[PDB]
Amino acid sequence: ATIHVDGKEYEVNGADNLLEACLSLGLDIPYFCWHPALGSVGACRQCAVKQYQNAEDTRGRLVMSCMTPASDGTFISIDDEEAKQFRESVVEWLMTNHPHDCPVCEEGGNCHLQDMTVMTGHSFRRYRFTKRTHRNQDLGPFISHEMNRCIACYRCVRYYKDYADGTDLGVYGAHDNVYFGRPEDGTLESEFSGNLVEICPTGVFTDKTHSERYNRKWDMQFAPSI
């Protein structure tokens, strides 16, 4: 398949969506709800690009790159001004209720939400009203729970139920009061519950064992091991 991103030609797989095709090409599109192993659901609305009908089209429309096939002869723009404004607005809407928590948050320096907030260029707060707040749950000895930091991207429930076939994690409530966790306090029963700390793009689900002796990612000495 042939796509044209910002006037540049690219050869991609037509069976892929535009988000994974553009990320495979090295282009940067902000995203939350999509994961490579979980598929596309189009929830967070972060991955907006401007799609044009043809080469001689200047109006276009905003589409979700994760929900749009990377079909042959597809004309899109990432750096379009309206697309950039909408992506910044999505980050801003996520920022309205987000707690002032980065210094005391185990995700800091390793946080996809921090990276996408910086990537969209959103650094000025004009929202002045109250932030919604949630109580936390005890999830056992491995996973720490902090629902204030949730951006309702649904990655956790999609991984835990649709991928890992777990039964004791879910989404509750409605509108801006959606809650992600167990129906009651208790240990997460899945043998693969620990992947939530990397699946969750925020600091809702964090490594409790690491949190005991916490340090930031830049301070780590890493090695590839088995």
Binding site: G42, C44, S89, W93, N97, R126
Partner: protein
């Protein structure tokens, strides 16, 4: 008002004492004749083409062609499990037509579902009815029992070998459940989040099977089409939208109510000749044509025919065609605050712009209501209207949410500007740190 079967196909069987019409009285008034004709003398594809060239459109509010929607079911013979769903949710503020249809004429809906399920080859049918319509549920269950005892429902209907079972699924109170894919999710026993399209429910809907979702009023328009023919339905009115529509006016008018009118009836004709105009001492200020999710229109738009195309080019939507009148004593900021509070709390929470941008508009409108607005609030509301439009959110709940806000800002900007009193302050002073004073 005189009601004839030829001019009022949906409401001519309505009794004067507002009592429901049961099977004997319905069948005495040409009931199930269209069902008999469709099930005996017509192929399912013939009925689908009959509805398609009759020009029947979706009465849920979008006006999509019903025959075209029926044609999109797969031609695969191995897909023998099919569902017809009747969207009896009707949760739009300002909409009360389906309650009238199912409370007093339940057999009309039952017959329309029978004809549609024969045309769609749907082995099962479900009436997705809201939980607050208690009398509609009682009357629909009684009508289903009466039709089952007389052979209109069940196995071997009319001796034709067609098996059709009709259920009534009572809802648990969310406005998003009326969205058709969210309706399917709710019918499956899940949280009523909508689904992305394509695939449309015609190919993979309820439990992955071919599914067709239709409004109560569309299925009620079906039997008169099948009984009187296509030619009668085309010559009801000389408008691009064929047939009759339940239209009304509500809200501080002399006669708030609901009347069956041809398409192309002007909104002024409904307001004065049917609703009696505004009440004494009240002056007309604005109106919404088709429910809470439509743009406001002014007095200059009252001389416009109630069609999809005419209201669409006026900057609004025809919607449910149940208009609401707003008098001069109603503050527009408080009205849009009420509307946005409804829309924000009825968010399903799936997607960011609606779930986290409708409450921001609610808070801004609440601040504007008590004169606590700050500069940049109206620009924020306009940006929210632009960025919650079609294609930006996952479903059409939020574009409908921001239609009245943008129309009220367009037409009544002086009321929104009057709430801006305080200067903008997002920060407090921190002792020891000199602030960066932006110009």
């Amino acid at each position: 008002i005189i009601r004839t079967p030829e001019t009022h196909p949906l409401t001519w069987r309505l009794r004067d004492d507002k009592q429901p019409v049961w099977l004997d009285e319905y069948r005495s008034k040409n009931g199930y004749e269209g069902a008999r004709k469709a099930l005996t003398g017509l192929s399912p594809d013939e009925i689908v083409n009959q509805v398609k060239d009759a020009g029947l459109k979706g009465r849920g509010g979008a006006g999509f062609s019903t025959g075209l929607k029926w044609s999109l079911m797969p031609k695969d013979e191995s897909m023998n499990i099919r569902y017809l769903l009747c969207n009896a949710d009707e949760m739009e503020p300002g909409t009360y037509k389906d309650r009238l249809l199912m409370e007093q004429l339940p057999h009309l809906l039952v017959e329309g579902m029978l004809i549609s399920a024969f045309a769609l080859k749907a082995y099962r049918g479900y009436i997705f009815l809201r939980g607050e319509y208690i009398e509609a549920a009682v009357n629909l269950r009684r009508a289903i029992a009466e039709a089952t005892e007389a052979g209109l429902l069940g196995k071997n209907i009319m001796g034709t070998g067609f098996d059709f079972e009709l259920f009534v699924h009572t809802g648990a109170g969310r406005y998003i459940c009326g969205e058709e894919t969210a309706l399917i999710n709710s019918l499956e026993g899940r949280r009523a989040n909508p689904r992305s399209k394509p695939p449309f429910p015609a190919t993979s809907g309820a439990w992955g099977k071919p599914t067709c979702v239709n409004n109560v009023e569309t299925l009620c328009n079906v039997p008169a089409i099948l009984a009187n023919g296509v030619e009668w339905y085309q010559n009801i009115s000389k408008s691009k939208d064929a047939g009759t529509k339940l239209m009304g006016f509500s809200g501080r008018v002399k006669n708030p109510g609901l009347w069956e009118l041809p398409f192309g009836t002007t909104a002024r004709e409904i307001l004065e000749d049917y609703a009696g105009g505004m009440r004494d001492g009240l002056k007309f200020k604005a109106w919404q044509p088709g429910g809470a999710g439509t743009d406001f229109l002014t007095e200059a738009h009252l001389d416009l025919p109630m069609e999809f195309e005419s209201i669409g080019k006026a900057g609004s939507r025809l919607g449910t065609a149940l208009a609401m009148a707003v008098d001069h004593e109603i503050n527009m900021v408080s009205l849009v605050r009420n509307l946005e509070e409804f829309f924000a709390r009825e968010s399903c929470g799936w997607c960011t712009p609606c779930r986290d941008g409708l409450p921001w508009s609610v808070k801004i409108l609440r601040a504007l209501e008590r004169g606590e607005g700050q500069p940049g609030d109206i620009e924020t509301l306009e940006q929210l209207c632009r960025f919650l439009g079609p294609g930006k959110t996952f479903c059409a709940h939020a574009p409908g949410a921001v239609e009245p806000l943008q129309s009220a800002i367009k037409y009544f900007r002086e009321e929104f500007e009057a709430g801006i009193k305080q200067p903008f302050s997002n920060t407090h002073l921190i002792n020891g740190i000199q602030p960066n004073l932006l110009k």
